[PDB]
Design a protein around this nucleic acid. Structure first.
Ligand SMILES: [K+]
Ligand SMILES: [K+]
Ligand SMILES: [K+]
Ligand SMILES: [K+]
Ligand SMILES: [K+]
Ligand SMILES: [K+]
Ligand SMILES: [K+]
Ligand SMILES: [K+]
Ligand SMILES: [K+]
Ligand SMILES: [K+]
Ligand SMILES: [K+]
Ligand SMILES: [K+]
Ligand SMILES: [K+]
Ligand SMILES: [K+]
Ligand SMILES: [K+]
Ligand SMILES: [K+]
Ligand SMILES: [K+]
Ligand SMILES: [K+]
Ligand SMILES: [K+]
Ligand SMILES: [K+]
Ligand SMILES: [K+]
Ligand SMILES: [K+]
Ligand SMILES: [K+]
Ligand SMILES: [K+]
Ligand SMILES: [K+]
Ligand SMILES: [K+]
Ligand SMILES: [K+]
Ligand SMILES: [K+]
Ligand SMILES: [K+]
Ligand SMILES: [K+]
Ligand SMILES: [K+]
Ligand SMILES: [K+]
Ligand SMILES: [K+]
Ligand SMILES: [K+]
Ligand SMILES: [K+]
Ligand SMILES: [K+]
Ligand SMILES: [K+]
Ligand SMILES: [K+]
Ligand SMILES: [K+]
Ligand SMILES: [Mg+2]
Ligand SMILES: [Mg+2]
Ligand SMILES: [Mg+2]
Ligand SMILES: [Mg+2]
Ligand SMILES: [Mg+2]
Ligand SMILES: [Mg+2]
Ligand SMILES: [Mg+2]
Ligand SMILES: [Mg+2]
Ligand SMILES: [Mg+2]
Ligand SMILES: [Mg+2]
Ligand SMILES: [Mg+2]
Ligand SMILES: [Mg+2]
Lengths: 49, 148, 204, 53, 85
RNA sequence: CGGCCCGAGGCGGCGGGGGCGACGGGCGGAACUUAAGCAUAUCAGUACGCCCCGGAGGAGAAACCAACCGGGAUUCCCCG
RNA sequence: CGCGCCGCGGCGAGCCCGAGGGCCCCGCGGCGGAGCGAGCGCGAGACGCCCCGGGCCCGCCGCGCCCCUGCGGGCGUGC
RNA sequence: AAGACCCUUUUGAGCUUGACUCCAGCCCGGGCCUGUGGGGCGGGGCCGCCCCGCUCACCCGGUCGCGCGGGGACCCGCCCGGGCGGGGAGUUCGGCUGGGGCGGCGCG
């Protein structure tokens, strides 16, 4: 589902702590906030640098 | 530029600064660095002590970022504080409001003690300290801290 | 469960009396046969399925016999000239293994098929026997089957000639990764050329 | 250029200069021979650009 | 030195201690195959040695055949059970 | 006398073979040269010889690196 | 192409058209900033228009004396 | 005709050998190939050797496979080990010096 809506997914990586998770879950949560799904706008460059 | 060079001021002179008795030949001494122990020993001993031989332990693979170790002196600690707030910290020297400087955030690990500090208390957080760095800071009323 | 687990367990110990007897009979017969021979069915069906054999129209199996021991250079009268580091004639070792040499020999015999993989069936003091799996790539049962029609691609011609099978890869060193293997990919020549290039940038 | 032909020196003893010669005796492979190579051929690895701060 | 010296190592974050990670039916396949095959000649020699109580000789022989000390120890521990009488 | 097994001749449809001054893959493999001589070393895992594809090829989704408040298949460029 | 020295330009405890991305714009290393010790490691203010010398400080090798958390700290002497 | 005699160059090559450093080849030993039985000797408290049947591996003959043999678990082959080895390969064969060489050694 994530791959479909445009998120790189790496099932070989393992987290090393809980802070890794908190930071990246904030990033996922905010992105899913800011995405729309179908005069539209095409984002440029790296997404959320 | 070819037109300002020494070599073209030698047109009409036969040999081009290389001599008539000696001349310009291919390799009158050998190629490269050869001869350093036999017929160039005067040069090698005059200018390159400790070029031949062996010295010390060897490591088959060095860990560059394990062995990396940046350092800062105490005469530099007050320049990491931006310029627009040092005047205030100096005027209102406080035991209850003291500037905290964390030097790993700026990319240093150990703190050495060259120089001197202004008469103002300060906490310094590093990962290791030298004896006289501790001495001078605790002499001006600061505190050394260890940071994770 | 099934039967091939028992067959695998059985083949993992060959010193036994039963297998010793069967191995003796097989080597006597192969000694009476030729060097490259077509086989009706695989002699080791479980190993054949492990390596990718399927009992379908388009899959064939051949037995290839190769000779044992080291290498001798072709030098007239046994004379190498030149520098003394290069003087040896006998006692040398081939760079590829006997499995790879078997696949290469059968590929040369049958150039209109595609070599897939190979496995061990017997040996004695003079010979080793392998079996090679080959696929005919113009059969419709091969072309129309998504599992195997990768090998109908023309970049799969004479794989054994270009070293792309399992034994060829082991000779090139590719069964390894990490420390000890950083000059082997994409190839030895390629890594040497990349490491020895002079790159003259414009704003040098 | 200049090095596609086949030429070698004739040596002393034939009353001629020692440059390499084509079969027949024609001079070649010298900057001073007609049809020889340049003494120092031009090459594209000359640094053409320059840097400015 | 393989680590970087700093006191307070593991001070900011909380690590993950992941879960660390038989087959009687495989055991059963082994039992049937052993039933119809037996053991290898070097294993028989080791059994005779163990029965005569030359333990160090058994270890030497197993090291010579297997080429690896842990694997040779595991082998003679396996064979003692069948060598006890 | 039939079945299965291992072979033999013929017939039909389909496929292979040769060709290239580059790039690419797999093998075999020098000597001149340098060391101010010369054997190890270097030149060079180059010249050259043989085989094999393609429009690219090879490589590739960890029996990897690490020692960190850690990364995460392959290729290529900068850097030492 | 690499190494040494000299001259000139820009900026200066800093400096910098990597590669790349949008004769213009943005752009990491790196080098310099601290040395010494085979290494465990420890770690520089005191003077001076400039130059030369003297003195003192840091490391490596040795040795008095005092002590706290101790084959660890402090304070000294010597080539 | 850039002396061919003579000398120098850290320039060669043909030939030799008791120069230096090696290579083919050949001889010798164990092991695998490699079966199935019977015996003797000695040691240590199972081990090491040695011998001799059989045929089925492996090898050699005869024959138009027209009415037949000989060897044999040894030989070959392969792996490792030791010896012989100018047949062959590569290379070296100091310096000073009233020219070089024989001689001498103001070569430390
Ligand atoms: K000059
Ligand atoms: K001169
Ligand atoms: K020279
Ligand atoms: K030279
Ligand atoms: K040289
Ligand atoms: K030298
Ligand atoms: K040493
Ligand atoms: K063969
Ligand atoms: K030669
Ligand atoms: K030669
Ligand atoms: K060479
Ligand atoms: K490999
Ligand atoms: K490597
Ligand atoms: K030519
Ligand atoms: K001439
Ligand atoms: K001349
Ligand atoms: K011409
Ligand atoms: K070579
Ligand atoms: K050479
Ligand atoms: K030579
Ligand atoms: K040489
Ligand atoms: K050499
Ligand atoms: K060497
Ligand atoms: K060499
Ligand atoms: K070499
Ligand atoms: K620049
Ligand atoms: K030291
Ligand atoms: K002359
Ligand atoms: K002459
Ligand atoms: K002469
Ligand atoms: K003379
Ligand atoms: K002469
Ligand atoms: K010469
Ligand atoms: K010579
Ligand atoms: K000659
Ligand atoms: K000669
Ligand atoms: K000659
Ligand atoms: K000889
Ligand atoms: K010679
Ligand atoms: Mg003049
Ligand atoms: Mg001169
Ligand atoms: Mg000398
Ligand atoms: Mg001429
Ligand atoms: Mg021309
Ligand atoms: Mg030389
Ligand atoms: Mg090399
Ligand atoms: Mg490909
Ligand atoms: Mg002459
Ligand atoms: Mg000389
Ligand atoms: Mg010579
Ligand atoms: Mg002389």
């Amino acid at each position: 589902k994530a791959r479909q809506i445009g998120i790189a997914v790496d099932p070989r990586r393992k987290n090393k702590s809980e802070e890794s998770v908190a930071r990246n879950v904030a990033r996922l949560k905010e992105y899913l906030s800011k995405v729309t799904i179908f005069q539209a706008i095409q984002h440029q460059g790296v997404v959320m640098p | 530029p070819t037109r300002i060079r020494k070599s073209r001021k030698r047109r009409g002179h036969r040999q081009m600064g290389y001599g008539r008795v000696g001349g310009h030949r291919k390799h009158p001494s050998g190629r490269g660095k050869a001869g350093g122990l036999q017929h160039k020993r005067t040069s090698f001993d005059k200018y390159h002590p400790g070029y031949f031989g062996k010295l010390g332990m060897r490591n088959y693979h060095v860990r560059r970022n394990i062995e990396y170790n940046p350092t800062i002196n105490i005469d530099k600690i007050w320049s990491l504080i931006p310029e627009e707030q040092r005047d205030g910290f100096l005027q209102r020297k406080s035991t209850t409001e003291a500037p905290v400087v964390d030097v790993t955030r700026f990319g240093f690990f150990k703190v050495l003690g060259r120089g001197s500090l202004p008469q103002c208390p300060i906490i310094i957080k590093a990962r290791y300290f030298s004896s006289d760095a501790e001495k001078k800071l605790r002499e001006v009323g600061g505190v050394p801290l260890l940071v994770p | 469960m099934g039967a091939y687990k028992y067959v695998q367990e059985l083949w993992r110990k060959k010193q036994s009396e039963a297998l010793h007897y069967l191995f003796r009979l097989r080597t006597w017969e192969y000694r009476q046969l030729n060097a490259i021979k077509r086989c009706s069915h695989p002699t080791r069906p479980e190993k054949a399925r492990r390596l990718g054999y399927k009992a379908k129209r388009g899959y064939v199996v051949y037995r290839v016999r190769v000779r044992r021991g080291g290498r001798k250079r072709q030098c007239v009268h046994g004379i190498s000239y030149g520098k003394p580091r290069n003087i040896g004639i006998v006692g040398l070792k081939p760079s590829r293994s006997l499995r790879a040499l078997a696949e290469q020999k059968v590929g040369r015999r049958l150039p209109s098929l595609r070599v897939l993989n190979s496995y061990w069936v017997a040996q004695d003091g003079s010979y080793k026997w392998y079996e090679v799996i080959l696929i005919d790539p113009f059969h419709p049962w091969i072309r129309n089957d998504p599992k195997i029609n990768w090998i109908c691609n023309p970049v799969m011609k004479r794989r054994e000639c270009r070293g792309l099978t399992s034994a060829g890869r082991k000779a090139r060193g590719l069964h390894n990764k990490g420390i000890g293997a950083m000059k082997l990919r994409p190839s030895k020549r390629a890594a040497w050329k990349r490491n020895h290039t002079r790159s003259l940038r414009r704003y040098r | 250029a200049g090095v596609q032909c086949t030429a070698h020196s004739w040596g002393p003893g034939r009353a001629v200069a020692r440059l390499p010669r084509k079969h027949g005796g024609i001079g070649a492979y010298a900057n001073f021979a007609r049809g020889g190579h340049m003494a120092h051929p031009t090459t594209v690895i000359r640094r053409w650009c320059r840097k400015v701060n | 030195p393989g680590k970087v010296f700093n006191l307070k190592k593991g001070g900011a974050v909380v690590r993950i201690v992941r879960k660390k990670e038989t087959k009687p039916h495989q055991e059963f396949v082994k039992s049937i195959i052993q039933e119809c095959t037996g053991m290898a000649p070097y294993e028989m020699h080791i059994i005779e040695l163990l029965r005569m109580n030359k333990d160090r000789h058994a270890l030497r022989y197993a090291k010579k055949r297997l080429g690896n000390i842990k694997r040779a120890k595991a082998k003679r521990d396996q064979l003692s059970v069948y060598a006890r009488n």
